[PDB]
Amino acid sequence: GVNEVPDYHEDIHTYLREMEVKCKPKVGYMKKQPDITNSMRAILVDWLVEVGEEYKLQNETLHLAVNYIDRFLSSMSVLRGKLQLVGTAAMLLASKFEEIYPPEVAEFVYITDDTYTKKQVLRMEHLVLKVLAFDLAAPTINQFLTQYFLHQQPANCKVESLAMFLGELSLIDADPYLKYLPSVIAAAAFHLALYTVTGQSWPESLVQKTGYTLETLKPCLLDLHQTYLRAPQHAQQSIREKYKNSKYHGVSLLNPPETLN
Amino acid sequence: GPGSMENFQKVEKIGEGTYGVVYKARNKLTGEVVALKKIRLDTETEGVPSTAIREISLLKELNHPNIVKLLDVIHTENKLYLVFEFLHQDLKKFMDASALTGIPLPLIKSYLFQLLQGLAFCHSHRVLHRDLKPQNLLINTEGAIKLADFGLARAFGVPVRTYTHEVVTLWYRAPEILLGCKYYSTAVDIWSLGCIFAEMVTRRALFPGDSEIDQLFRIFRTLGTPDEVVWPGVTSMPDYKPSFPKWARQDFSKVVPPLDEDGRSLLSQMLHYDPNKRISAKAALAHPFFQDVTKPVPHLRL
Ligand SMILES: CC(=O)Nc1ccc(Br)cc1
Ligand SMILES: CC(=O)Nc1ccc(Br)cc1
Ligand SMILES: CC(=O)Nc1ccc(Br)cc1
C-alpha cells in the first residue's frame, strides 16, 4: 500500500484541494484577451496533446502545461503570433518538472517549425517562471483521478482510461471548463467513465473523501456529458486520436450514454 | 521577490555544487544572515535547470521549522539567486569534528525526532526528498536540525508512478531502488533516515558500499538476505537474482550495539525490507524512543 501512501493520502488530498484554489486561472480571462479566443487556445492545447504524443510525455505533463498557460494568460495579454511561444515554454517547464527525461530545448524549437528561436523559447521560459513566481507544483485533474481510482471495486482499466480521456477533453475548451476546479472535473470524469463502462455511480466512499455528491457535480457532469457526446464533431481531434491507442485501451472508441439517468 | 543583490553583503564561501557556489551573506538593511545559492543561467544552453525548478517550486510550499526556509529568489541577468535561511553547519561536519567521543543520546533523539517532523511534513505535501544524508541536514546554534538540498526532490502523485531510478546517494539508498523496483514511495526517505539514525550513534555509515551490488550485499549481510516471507515480491523484482547469497539475519542488537531496546525497535522499523511494513515518519513520531525528548519545538521562520 506504500505506493498509495496510506499514511499521507488524506493529508495530500486536503492539500491538493487547497492548492487547486490557489493555482486556479481567472474564469473569464479570454474576454479580457484582445487578440486571442477560446478557439485559438483549443488549437494550442490540441497541438500540445500531439507534442505530448510525439515525444511520449506523461499525461501529467500535458495537464501541468495547460495550467501554466491558463495562469499566464490570466495576467499577460498575448498576440496570436505569440500564443504558441507561451505554449512551447509552458510544455518545456512542465517537462522539466514532471518528466524523467525531458526533451531538450532544441526539440521544443523544432516542433514549432522554427516559428521561434531557441533564445525566444528560453526568454519566454523565464517570463513564465516570473509570472507564475515558480509556482509550478499545481494540482491537476490527473492528480485527483488517480486517487479516485483507488475507490473502484474492482479496478477497471477501461474506467481508468476513459476517465483520463474525458479529463483531457476538458482541457481543450476554456468555456466551460475554466469555471470548474480540477477536483470537480476529475469527479465528473470519474463518474461518467464509471457509469458508461459499468453502469455504476459516484461511490459513497468518494462522497466521504471529497464532500462532493452527484448533486454538487451535476453542472460539470452535464457539460462533460455534452462534450463527450459531441467529441466526434469537435474541430479538435488529437485527444480522440490519441485514445484509440491500445495504451489507453482504445477508450475513445466506446459509445457515450445517451442519458446520465 | 522583495529583494535585490544591492541589499546583501557577501561574507564568505560556504559551499559549492553542480550549478554553483553558496555564500554566507548578510542583509544590510535587516541584519539577517542568509545563505545565497547562485545558479548560473548564462552558461546554461538548456535554460533554467530542472534541479532548480523543482527546488524552488517545492520549497515555496514547504514552510516547516525542520525544513530550511527559502526566503526569496532573485532573477537577475543570466543569474538566479536562491536566498535561504542560514544554518552554520551540517550533520556530517558535526559528527566529524565535534562528536569525537560520541553524540549524546538526548541530542540524537532530538535530532531524529526533528528530522521525522520535517520529513512527515514533506510526505504530507506530496514531496519525496530522495537524498537524505548527513551532508544535507543543517544544524543551527540553538539545537534545530533541518532538511536541506531539495535538488533531487520530486512532487509525487497518489499512487506514485515510475520516477528516476538510481536516486539517493548510494550509502543511504533503499533496497527497492537497488533492486530496480518499478515504483518507490515515501519509504525510501525513511530508509535514508534509518541509515542516518545508525550513523549518528556510531558516527560511521551503516552500509558503505562501493557499487550497487556491494551495497545490496552489505545490506543483506546485516539484515539477512530477504525472501518472500519477509518481503512479498522481492524475488520478482527486476534486478533480483536467484543466485544472491542467502545470508542469515544477524540479531539486531549486534547491528548498533550501544543502542537501547527502544532505539533498536525504532531502527528495525525504519530498516524493514518490505516498504509496505517500513514505518512512516508520521507513525514514528509516536515511538517510545522519543518519550523523553523535551527540546522545545523550533520556531517557523518568516
Ligand atoms: C486560429 C487563428 O486565427 N490563428 C491562430 C494562430 C496561432 C494559434 Br496557436 C492558433 C490560432
Ligand atoms: C553548510 C553551511 O555552512 N550552511 C548552509 C546553509 C544553507 C545551505 Br542551502 C547550504 C549551506
Ligand atoms: C552486477 C555486478 O557488478 N556484480 C554482481 C555480482 C554478483 C551478482 Br549475483 C550480480 C552482480
Is B131 labeled as catalytic in the residue annotation?
yes
Q: Distance between CA atoms of B247 and B267, rounded to whole angstroms? A: 20
Burial annotation B222-253 (CB, 10 A radius, 16+ → b, else e): bbebbeeeebeebeebeebeeebeeeeeeeee
Q: How far apart are CA B56 and CA B64, in angstroms?
A: 15
- 3-class secondary-structure state, position B280: coil
Mutate to test the interface with A, among B44, B57, B150, B186 (most CBs of A within 10 A): B57
CB A186 within 8 A of CB A24: no
Spatial separation of the C-alpha atoms in residues A94 and B294, rounded to whole Å:
44
Q: Using CA atoms, how far apart are residues A88 and B141, in angstroms rounded to an integer? A: 47
| Annotated domain spans of chain B | 5-88, 89-299
Distance, in Å, from the CA atom of A128 to the CA atom of A118, rounded to the nearest integer, reads 15
* Top CATH class, B89-299: mainly alpha
For B138, the 3-state DSSP assignment is strand
Q: Report the candidate in A69, A226, A10, A153 with the shortest Cα–Cα distance to residue B125.
A: A10
Tell me which H or E stretch contains B96.
helix B91-97
Do B126 and A12 make contact, defined as CB atoms within 8 angstroms? yes
C-alpha cell at B115: 528530522
CA A257 to chain centre: 22
Return the closest-CA partner of residue A72 out of A80, A83, A62, A61: A83
Q: Which of B47, B60, B187 is nearest residue A125 as measured by Cβ atoms? A: B47
- Check CB contact of A4 with chain B, cutoff 8 Å: yes
A91 to A69, A96, A164, A187: CA distances (angstroms):
9, 9, 19, 25
State if residue A84 touches ligand 1 by the CB under 6 angstroms criterion.
yes
CB B20 within 8 A of CB B81: no
User: B70 pairs with which residues across the strands?
Assistant: B84
Q: Is the dihedral of CA B76, B80, B84, B90 positive or negative?
A: negative
- Give the β-pairing of B137-139 and B89-90: antiparallel
**Cβ–Cβ < 8 Å for B143, B133:** no
Dihedrals phi, psi of B34, to nearest 5 degrees: -135, 165
DSSP assigned state of B103 = -
**How many helices (H) and strands (E) would you count in chain B?**
8, 10
C-alpha cell of B196? 542516518
Q: What is the DSSP string of A78-123?
A: --GGGHHHHHHHHHHHHHHHH-SSPPPHHHHHHHTTTSS-HHHHHH
In 3D space, the residue among A166, A169, A170, A192 whose CA is nearest the CA of residue A179 turns out to be: A170
Interface of A with B in 127-166 (CB under 8 A): 129-130, 133-137, 142-143, 146-147, 150
Domains in chain A, CATH or no CATH each: 11-24+138-261 (1.10.472.10), 25-137 (1.10.472.10)
Do A135 and B160 make contact, defined as CB atoms within 8 angstroms?
no
CA distances from A2 to A7, A29, B166, B187, B265 (A): 8, 41, 19, 7, 20
| Assigned C-alpha cell, B271 | 530498516
Do residues A208 and A15 make contact, with C-beta atoms less than 8 angstroms apart? no
Cα(first)–Cα(last) distance of chain B, in Å? 14
3-state secondary structure at position A34: coil
Which residue in the list B42, B72, B96, B131 is annotated as catalytic? B131
Residue ranges of alpha helices (H) inside chain A are 9-22, 38-54, 59-73, 83-98, 105-111, 118-132, 141-149, 157-172, 174-177, 182-198, 204-210, 214-230, 238-242
Tell how far CA B32 is from the center of its chain. Answer: 26
Name the resolution in angstroms: 2.4
Which residues fall within 8 angstroms of residue A119, CB to CB, at 6 or more apart?
Answer: none
In 3D, which of A196, A205, A189, A201 has the Cα closest to residue A150?
Answer: A205
Cα-atom radius of gyration of chain B, to the nearest Å?
A: 20
Q: In CATH, which superfamily holds the domain spanning B5-88?
A: Phosphorylase Kinase; domain 1 (3.30.200.20)
Give the residue carrying C-alpha cell 484577451.
A33
Which among A3, A7, A19 has CB closest to B283? Answer: A7
d(C-alpha A132, C-alpha A166), whole Å: 27
**CA gap B241, A126 in Å, rounded:** 47
Is residue A168 within 8 A of residue A49, CB to CB? The reply is yes
Q: In this structure, what are the phi and psi dihedrals at residue B206, rounded to the nearest 5 degrees?
A: -70, -40
